[PDB]
């Protein structure tokens, strides 16, 4: 009845793609009970993403207050509101320019050895148990761990520090849920205080003793421009990067593993050259999303129409990226897992010239898209090579959420013969 509630029901946390098809055909410009709109077709989603900046503005202070009424003047909402995802041009333009100057393709490629090293170490840790015929929850022992250890490497942080930060993130997000208790609010403000204090200390540390990591580069001088992120901007940028990769990459890894196990005839892509591996990962992304529906508010600047449906000035429009990715006008035979769609093409572009929507499009296109892609391209062949007879051990347990599609468990074992 209400698309956001329908998509969060258990069966739709499980397989929402039949309902998404229904929306695309029967209610493509869905108005929820709240008044927020939801676009499900590839064409309309692509349009809305590329119109962000002109036709759609970012959320104002009034918009965030309405979306987070319980936390309207809290430190935690102030921190969220300062992140790149919640900014609009021209402030967004400068902030994105400055982080992209230092968070580069070369910087990300320099993490590839570390991704292999972490994967090798975590897989070694469970090899004995798997060899004895036991079941391992790969989500808990691997998928959620690798992205955090890679953030530690990128930022120049300790493992202990990144795991405490992740715990703070969980607390903060709990405090921004609409049902949040006053106690969760207080815990969120305390965790937000700690996050700021931590990053302040990290910035000061790398400023005195720079290293090769991203924070050291961000806080040091730059030859071409003397523009740079201020300390308050730096805290917000590092925080927003962590939030962006908090649970998304882990869900991606989980989905890739599940696709490897469901379609063992496609494992060959992971055994091939760089172009072959990349194609598998592109199709993993096309096949599932970690949120489904978008988190960034897009506020209509004026009365818009999509078809004969009016979206009034001031309304909030969200997009169902996972539905666009299974739209047959963009991806023929959309329910088939087929990496050849993306073989030899530009990242996120099919052989027919239709774009993958898993990272968005336009000015808010995922800052971490290359980092996510490279993490998957390096770890998945290693997993496939270490445990050639890995199989699914039981049904994955999905993590109940109103906003995200993540797993609590991904149980795996080796195919054993007595």
Count Cα neighbours of 279 within 13 Å in the Cβ-side half-sphere: 22
Please state whether the peptide bond connecting residue 90 to the residue before it is cis, i.e. omega within 30 degrees of 0: yes
Positive/negative CA dihedral, 237, 358, 405, 291: positive
The residue with its CB nearest to ligand HEM is 368
- Residues contacting residue 219 through CB under 8 Å, at least 6 positions apart: 203, 206, 207, 210, 228, 234
Q: CB of residue 45 vs ligand HEM: minimum separation in angstroms?
A: 10
Q: Binding of ligand HEM at residue 249 (CB under 6 A)? A: yes
**Residue closest to 355 by CA, chosen among 318, 320, 327, 333:** 327
Q: Binding of ligand HEM at residue 322 (CB under 6 A)? A: no
| Binds ligand HEM (CB under 6 A): choice among 24, 255, 364, 405 | 364
| Binds ligand HEM (CB under 6 A): choice among 53, 290, 334, 348 | 290
| Binds ligand HEM (CB under 6 A): choice among 248, 350, 384, 406 | 248
x-or-dash pattern for ligand HEM, window 31-70, by CB under 6 A? ----------------------------------------
Q: Which is nearer to ligand HEM, 187 or 372 (CB)?
A: 372
Q: Binding of ligand HEM at residue 269 (CB under 6 A)? A: no
Q: CB of residue 133 vs ligand HEM: minimum separation in angstroms?
A: 32
Backbone conformation region of residue 30, classed left if phi is above 0, alpha if psi is from -120 to 50, else beta:
beta
| Binds ligand HEM (CB under 6 A): choice among 325, 358, 406, 409 | 358
Q: Which is nearer to ligand HEM, 47 or 190 (CB)?
A: 47
Q: CB of residue 4 vs ligand HEM: minimum separation in angstroms?
A: 15
Integer angstrom CA distances of residue 226 from 103, 222, 229, 232: 17, 6, 10, 17
How close are the terminal C-alpha atoms of the chain, in Å?
A: 52
Q: How many CB atoms lie within 10 A of CB 208?
A: 8
Positive/negative CA dihedral, 353, 359, 363, 367: negative
Q: How many CB atoms lie within 10 A of CB 97?
A: 11
Q: Per the annotation, where are the binding residues for heme b?
A: 92, 96, 294, 298, 364, 366
Q: Distance between CA atoms of 320 and 304, rounded to whole angstroms?
A: 19
Q: Which is nearer to ligand HEM, 244 or 414 (CB)?
A: 244
| Binds ligand HEM (CB under 6 A): choice among 296, 356, 374, 414 | 296
| Binds ligand HEM (CB under 6 A): choice among 30, 41, 75, 96 | 96
| Binds ligand HEM (CB under 6 A): choice among 372, 380, 393, 404 | 372
Q: Distance between CA atoms of 185 and 188, rounded to whole angstroms?
A: 5
Q: Binding of ligand HEM at residue 256 (CB under 6 A)? A: no
Q: Which is nearer to ligand HEM, 126 or 151 (CB)?
A: 151
| Binds ligand HEM (CB under 6 A): choice among 45, 85, 258, 414 | 85
- Residues contacting residue 244 through CB under 8 Å, at least 6 positions apart: 85, 366, 367, 368
Q: Which residues bind ligand HEM (CB under 6 A)?
A: 84-85, 96, 240-241, 244-245, 248-249, 252, 290, 294, 296, 321, 358-360, 364, 366-368, 371-372
């Amino acid at each position: 009845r209400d698309a956001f509630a329908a998509l969060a029901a258990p069966e739709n946390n499980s397989n929402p793609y039949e309902y998404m098809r229904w929306l695309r055909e029967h209610d493509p410009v869905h108005r929820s009970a709240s008044g927020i709109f939801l676009l499900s077709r590839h064409a309309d989603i692509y349009w809305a993403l590329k119109a962000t900046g002109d036709t759609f503005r970012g959320p104002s202070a009034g918009d965030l207050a309405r979306l987070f009424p319980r936390a309207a003047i809290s430190r935690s909402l102030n921190l969220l509101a300062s992140t790149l995802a919640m900014k609009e041009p021209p402030t967004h333009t400068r902030l994105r320019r400055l982080i992209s100057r230092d968070f580069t393709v070369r910087q990300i490629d320099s993490l590839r050895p570390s991704i292999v090293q972490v994967t090798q170490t975590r897989l070694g840790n469970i090899a004995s148990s798997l060899e004895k015929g036991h079941v391992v929850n790969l989500h808990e022992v691997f998928s959620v761990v690798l992205p955090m250890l890679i953030f530690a490497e990128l930022f120049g942080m300790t493992q202990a520090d990144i795991f405490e930060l992740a715990a703070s993130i969980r607390t903060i997000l709990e405090g921004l849920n609409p049902h949040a208790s006053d106690e969760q609010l207080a815990a969120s403000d305390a965790a937000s205080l700690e996050v700021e204090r931590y990053f302040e200390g990290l910035i000061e540390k790398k400023r005195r003793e720079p290293q090769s990591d991203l924070v050291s580069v961000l806080v040091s001088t730059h030859d071409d421009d003397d523009d740079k992120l201020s300390d308050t901007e730096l805290i917000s940028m590092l925080w927003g990067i962590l939030l962006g990769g908090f649970a998304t990459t882990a869900a991606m890894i989980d989905h890739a593993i599940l696709d490897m196990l469901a379609f063992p005839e496609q494992r060959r892509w992971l055994e091939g050259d760089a172009a072959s591996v990349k194609a598998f990962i592109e199709e993993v992304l096309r096949y599932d999303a970690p949120a489904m529906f978008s988190s960034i508010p897009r506020i209509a600047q004026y009365d818009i129409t999509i078809g004969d449906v009016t979206i009034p000035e001031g309304a909030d429009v969200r997009v169902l990226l996972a539905s666009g990715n299974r739209d047959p006008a963009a991806f023929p035979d959309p329910d088939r897992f087929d990496p050849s769609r993306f073989h030899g093409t530009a990242p996120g572009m099919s052989t027919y010239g239709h774009v993958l929507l898993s990272f968005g499009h336009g000015i808010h296109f995922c800052l971490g898209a290359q980092l996510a892609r490279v993490q998957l391209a390096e770890c998945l062949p290693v997993i496939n090579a270490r445990f050639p007879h890995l199989v699914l051990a039981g049904d994955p347990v999905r993590e109940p959420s109103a906003f995200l599609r993540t797993f609590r468990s991904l149980p795996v074992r080796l195919d054993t013969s007595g």
